[PDB]
Amino acid sequence: QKMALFFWQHGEEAMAKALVACKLCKAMAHEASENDMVDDISQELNHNSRDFG
């Protein structure tokens, strides 16, 4: 996510990048919590969903 916030500052279509990253993030969270693999991963990645959100 440190790389991702960097790459959001450079290049165009920034409003699009914020929304699509928010889509791909939170969906990847809750689908990974179907497997509930080391939940630590899931709530920090929803944390990134509110960050991009």
Add this chain to the structure above:
Amino acid sequence: QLAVELLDQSYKQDEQLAMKLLTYELKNWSNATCLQLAVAAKHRDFIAHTCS
């Protein structure tokens, strides 16, 4: 609170050795584990943590 923060820091460092910490048989403490002593203590936040 010290128990909760120590489990938290154990989980921040390594989840696996935190598991070895919780399931451990405490030879001095009547051969019981941390879980049984915690549920004896009725301490809700310890059990409510992600690791346990």
